[PDB]
Ligand binder design. Sequence first.
Ligand SMILES: *[C@@H]1O[C@H](CO)[C@@H](O[C@@H]2O[C@H](CO)[C@@H](O[C@@H]3O[C@H](CO)[C@@H](O)[C@H](O)[C@@H]3O)[C@H](O)[C@H]2NC(C)=O)[C@H](O)[C@H]1NC(C)=O
Ligand SMILES: *[C@@H]1O[C@H](CO)[C@@H](O)[C@H](O)[C@H]1NC(C)=O
Ligand SMILES: *[C@@H]1O[C@H](CO)[C@@H](O)[C@H](O)[C@H]1NC(C)=O
Ligand SMILES: *[C@@H]1O[C@H](CO)[C@@H](O)[C@H](O)[C@H]1NC(C)=O
Ligand SMILES: *[C@@H]1O[C@H](CO)[C@@H](O)[C@H](O)[C@H]1NC(C)=O
Ligand SMILES: *[C@@H]1O[C@H](CO)[C@@H](O)[C@H](O)[C@H]1NC(C)=O
Ligand SMILES: [Ca+2]
Ligand SMILES: [Ca+2]
Ligand SMILES: [Ca+2]
Ligand SMILES: [Ca+2]
Ligand SMILES: [Ca+2]
Ligand SMILES: [Ca+2]
Ligand SMILES: [Ca+2]
Ligand SMILES: [Ca+2]
Ligand SMILES: [Ca+2]
Ligand SMILES: [Ca+2]
Ligand SMILES: [Ca+2]
Ligand SMILES: [Ca+2]
Lengths: 276, 276, 271, 397, 132, 132
Amino acid sequence: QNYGLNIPITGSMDTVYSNSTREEVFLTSTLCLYYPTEASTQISDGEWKDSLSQMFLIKGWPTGSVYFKEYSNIVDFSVDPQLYCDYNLVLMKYDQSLELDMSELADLILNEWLCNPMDITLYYYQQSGESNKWISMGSSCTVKVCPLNTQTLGIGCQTTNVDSFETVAENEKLAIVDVVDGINHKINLTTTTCTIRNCKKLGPRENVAVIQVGGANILDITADPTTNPQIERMMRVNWKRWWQVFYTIVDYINQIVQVMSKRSRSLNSAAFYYRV
Amino acid sequence: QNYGLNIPITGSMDTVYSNSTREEVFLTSTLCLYYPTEASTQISDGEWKDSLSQMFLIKGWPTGSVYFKEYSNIVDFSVDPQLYCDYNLVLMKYDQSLELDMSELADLILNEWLCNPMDITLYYYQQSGESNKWISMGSSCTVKVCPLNTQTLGIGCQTTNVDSFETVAENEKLAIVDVVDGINHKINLTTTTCTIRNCKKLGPRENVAVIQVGGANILDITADPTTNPQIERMMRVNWKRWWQVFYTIVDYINQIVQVMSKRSRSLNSAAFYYRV
Amino acid sequence: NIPITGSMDTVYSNSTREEVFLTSTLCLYYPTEASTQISDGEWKDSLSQMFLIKGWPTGSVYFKEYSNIVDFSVDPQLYCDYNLVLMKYDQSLELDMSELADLILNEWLCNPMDITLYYYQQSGESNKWISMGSSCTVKVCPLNTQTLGIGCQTTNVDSFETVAENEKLAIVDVVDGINHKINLTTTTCTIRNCKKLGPRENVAVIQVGGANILDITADPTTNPQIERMMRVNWKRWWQVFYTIVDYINQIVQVMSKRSRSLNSAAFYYRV
Amino acid sequence: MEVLYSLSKTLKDARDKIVEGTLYSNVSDLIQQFNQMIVTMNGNDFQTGGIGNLPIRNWTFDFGLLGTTLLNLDANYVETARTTIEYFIDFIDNVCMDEMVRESQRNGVAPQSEALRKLAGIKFKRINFNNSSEYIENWNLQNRRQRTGFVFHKPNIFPYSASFTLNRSQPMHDNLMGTMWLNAGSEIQVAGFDYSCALNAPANIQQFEHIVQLRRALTTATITLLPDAERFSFPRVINSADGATTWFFNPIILRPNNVEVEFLLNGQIINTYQARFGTIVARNFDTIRLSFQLMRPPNMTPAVNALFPQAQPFQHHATVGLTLRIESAVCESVLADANETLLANVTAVRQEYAIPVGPVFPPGMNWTELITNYSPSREDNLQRVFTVASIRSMLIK
Amino acid sequence: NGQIINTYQARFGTIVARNFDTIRLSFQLMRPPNMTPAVNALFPQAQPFQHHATVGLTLRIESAVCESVLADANETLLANVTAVRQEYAIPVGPVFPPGMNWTELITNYSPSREDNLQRVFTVASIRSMLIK
Amino acid sequence: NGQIINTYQARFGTIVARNFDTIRLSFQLMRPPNMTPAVNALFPQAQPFQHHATVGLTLRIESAVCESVLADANETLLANVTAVRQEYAIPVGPVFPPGMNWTELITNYSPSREDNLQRVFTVASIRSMLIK
Ligand SMILES: *[C@@H]1O[C@H](CO)[C@@H](O[C@@H]2O[C@H](CO)[C@@H](O[C@@H]3O[C@H](CO)[C@@H](O)[C@H](O)[C@@H]3O)[C@H](O)[C@H]2NC(C)=O)[C@H](O)[C@H]1NC(C)=O
Ligand SMILES: *[C@@H]1O[C@H](CO)[C@@H](O)[C@H](O)[C@H]1NC(C)=O
Ligand SMILES: *[C@@H]1O[C@H](CO)[C@@H](O)[C@H](O)[C@H]1NC(C)=O
Ligand SMILES: *[C@@H]1O[C@H](CO)[C@@H](O)[C@H](O)[C@H]1NC(C)=O
Ligand SMILES: *[C@@H]1O[C@H](CO)[C@@H](O)[C@H](O)[C@H]1NC(C)=O
Ligand SMILES: *[C@@H]1O[C@H](CO)[C@@H](O)[C@H](O)[C@H]1NC(C)=O
Ligand SMILES: [Ca+2]
Ligand SMILES: [Ca+2]
Ligand SMILES: [Ca+2]
Ligand SMILES: [Ca+2]
Ligand SMILES: [Ca+2]
Ligand SMILES: [Ca+2]
Ligand SMILES: [Ca+2]
Ligand SMILES: [Ca+2]
Ligand SMILES: [Ca+2]
Ligand SMILES: [Ca+2]
Ligand SMILES: [Ca+2]
Ligand SMILES: [Ca+2]
């Protein structure tokens, strides 16, 4: 029927309650680190996953819980980011000129998305509202749009001559393009190398957390210019040695999972629900 | 909306139950047929998808709401079979020696598996209870499990000699491997080609129906040998001509959809439990 | 601490700014490049005369030049009663600048460590190991219950896990509750086991360069922008010093008198 | 019981009007009443107490009548009057304490306390003096019903109840919506909160509604209705409905717009007020429906616009509240107040002598439980002990 | 007199006291053992402490019986006495405080002060019988 | 009033309640620890669940005593009142529900309704003394 959405839950403000709804379908909670390959490169070891598992066992996580996952670099990890796992932490090595791509991957993973396909070559698409974006992921996406009049005549671009189209993202693994909400649009990109999806944004995925390893605070997940929220899960550290970074994470792991909350988790590993 | 809470709900018995919903589900949802390529090969046509779409339209569905998918054969389809599609049918042609593979696929796409990754090279894995299996997918999976004593010395095998291990799958595209629930194991499986996930089985996936096109009752979705239940969604139809099979499905599409049901994990009401 | 009762109707007292300016001393720690760009040397006397307008008597201001941030990190003695630390930011010095800011801003209780005999744990969240020296390269090898390395061999220093290299100052946090063996160049660098008490009210850090990057709290979750970590843009060190002098009242208002029954004696520039 | 009241009234009058130098014309009738009381009570034995620690005592009466041949009272007269009156007052005090400590599940109106049970006989009707006090007068009317009413100043009719409901919620409690409330004494403070400031509500208006079910109907009540519940206008952390985890609450007070307040009796709306604050009246009401709304401001300054975003973070959470004080009312049944010490007297008497918990009242005379469950037997017992407490208070303070 | 006469433990709402010279309010602040991330960020284990936990108690004395005389919210006796003194500018006496401010009159409420207060209050009652 | 007046544990058959206002029935469904093969087949470990376990209680108030007047299976007063209303088609009045639907009359049993009900039932009995 439902899980009792449409009826209210009552509680007293002057009583501390005792009995709890114990439920568990798991082995146990599983911490899950995503680290760039340069971390292991600098570490130059290879019993180090064993070392970190032994550390986590002291911190209170059984052996078979913690998982370590390598990704080449943040731009290449962005393409179809899969979080196959329960308590996700993502270590993003900040460097100049990757500000937008980092902020965009953070926006993709930290938030829940509901995506429909886009038969690009047939129809023309709009954007319903503030929470609607077009997420394009692939080996090399190059999104060229063309807005349309009410008469279905392009404005600033002839709908036939693709060279006049306005390029909004040029050769990127992941591009979260927001266009003007209420304009029909003709879209052109490299259909073989990229897939574009019409994605609404539900509430925030309160499961995955993002540790920015490098410098200044730049992560602006909220595509709006006015608001620049600093969520609890936008964690950051100052680094020189990846061993120091991993020791910091291990030492303060309990606080990190206290910030997170595992109740939000999907069956599939995908970073976005797909609703055809 | 009290997502993520099991709130009891009261319901009368004198309430006059409401009207039909078939028109709603037909005008909203998306029917979605997965058929083997030999079906089209015997059909020897290529307007036939359009013809079936028009016949579905006569039977109620909108034009663009019935979608057709092809697959080379069941064993190749079994590799990460994802059904992102609102009402799924899987036509499944039966042949000898594919009984276990058909059962594997049927189990996988009929029951909701929630699952965590496995790091074969590092951890020893223990199956928690009845509902926990390991599903391995890839182009060639050859799992080799060595059970371990409480001292972590292998029995019937040696930890350092993969030859003595006890194989329980050879080059299978999909393998739902079970082991003695309560013993540690060390696994070896070809990490480059085939991946393995520690999965446990939630309730049934109600959005998927499997139409066995050939032989007798053989799908044992329940890994337990004592119980061999006949789920509603495991249909069976005798065949001699793929046109006749498709016509039967088209004619009885109402009853098939009635047997099926909307995916619980896709409803909004399942938001903070395991929503997908 | 005994209780101290106080009414909620007593009238506000007069301004104590003049009393504290007559009774205290201010001291500025700036990098050598400041003087190099100023290209002067009557400038200390000129700035003292300038402070005298704001009300600091002639001897109250002490200018203690330091070579640069990483070199000043090694055991900074803050000979003063109100300390300002101008801190020029450069890319890739983020962590070392943060290390110095954490060290001076926070009050630490440090104990000696004998690396050659004992294997050291970390008691909890507030405990760190601070290594200071001409070149500190601390390598850590964690140990089992039987004192055997994990990820390392206890006798092969090459297999150890380096957590700092050639750094004048390193504040290492390792996983708490596990014994470690340390390799640090005993002739060069000194390592101490320190616990972070409350904050040090005496010192303020004026970051001179870039974005808000200092993270005193080693916890990843919290990144609190404390009031004493001020920041200002710059092109001319003269403009920086004039800014500080003009707004000196606000800076010393942000700072407050130090309160701790110290035990280590050291030189102070008090009146 | 009317006899016990008459005893107390005539002793109070004796202590007041039989004073030195007063004309006998001023106290002729009182002296006649006092002599009737003396002659009726004389030659009798009463026994009082014997429950808990209330010590057993025996009262025997043999007194000479107050004289009547005196034109103008002198000092010697008042000495004899005092010697009689003090003993009588002690007797009445002990009888009242004995009656208050006792209970009865059935026929709670009928007197407990064998002393008062004897006083309810036929020989003692001649003491009946007059029934002026509000409690005794209503006692007579209730014992033979004409319509009655006790006028109460700020009656504590609501059981103490502070709580909340969440019409919208999450496990991580970021985006809540619902109501918090506290009913205590004569106060209803109800605050509807929305964490999204009605961002996505129909027409940017969120509806809140609070139903309060009085245990007894009140009549001609005066009600002070104001906006902005105070107790729910500062930040808090609240244990969840299940109690597993706590959730933050960070109010920003908007006003409640088109607030409607309905006073209902037996399901039909007796009174209704719409956007009227200050003092109002309720004719006869048994339940209160406070319906109000949270409208997102159409126009917004930069500051408030920065406060209320369109995304999930929602640092500040909008709330609108009402406060409702029942300043005065009239109830057919009896209740505690802020002006009457009847409940205090009864509870103090029970506590002093450590009476075991009886069958009907709750332990410690816990008024919250007592008003929560207020069955008719409990009501009758409460009325009896309250009127006896009034009779006691007429002499002993 | 330092003798525990009544004790109410975790009971709110209306309570009673037979006879009491002192009130001892004892309460505790328990750190919430479980914490939503909002409250967790609100209370950090570090030093800054930007929001300060509090726990309160309000206690009205709705009604009481006192052996000695006091001012009330229901009685105009104190107002009558003070007004009569002020209207004619009586010089400050040796016993009552200047202006008869109730705060300083009850901060030190010696028996002589109580006696004079009872006398003037009773006279005020007698006057208010006629001249309201 | 929230206090257990009586409590019976695993005592079926006729029981007695002295005086009560609420009934709390607690029971439990205990999985059979030992199972014949037939019942073990009935109750599997997996999801299908073609048979659903159930445990029930039946509680009949054979006779009782009440202060407020009620309807019974023995007294024809409710029937008499409703019948004499229906005979002459009395329009729906303020307090009683339409048609004297006893379920709606008792689901909320306000004192006004109770007083009127006692009056009309008394008159019904007075009439029943002569007219049948
Ligand atoms: C942490 O690791 C470093 C790295 O090795 C240690 O440095 C070692 O220090 C010892 C004693 O100062 C050196 O011993 C020398 O051996 C040569 C012959 O082997 C001899 O000629 C000298 O008289 C002296 O005994 C050793 O060479 C040196 N290692 C290297 C690679 O230079 C350091 O001592 C370790 N920390 C501690 C606290 O031991
Ligand atoms: C136990 O939890 C329930 C919620 O399902 C709650 O209503 C009840 O009050 C809790 N128990 C106690 C003793 O509070
Ligand atoms: C994009 O534009 C190029 C250049 O005209 C064209 O060849 C290509 O077909 C376009 N993409 C799509 C999906 O039509
Ligand atoms: C259901 O259908 C019947 C007739 O088909 C119709 O009278 C009725 O109104 C329908 N129900 C609703 C809720 O419209
Ligand atoms: C499995 O064993 C083979 C040797 O037969 C080895 O080459 C391979 O690396 C092993 N795989 C794993 C995952 O250990
Ligand atoms: C405090 O300031 C007031 C107003 O300027 C001044 O009158 C007073 O003298 C000052 N206090 C002292 C101790 O000088
Ligand atoms: Ca991008
Ligand atoms: Ca153009
Ligand atoms: Ca947009
Ligand atoms: Ca933004
Ligand atoms: Ca073997
Ligand atoms: Ca297979
Ligand atoms: Ca198994
Ligand atoms: Ca089976
Ligand atoms: Ca190593
Ligand atoms: Ca350093
Ligand atoms: Ca540490
Ligand atoms: Ca930090």
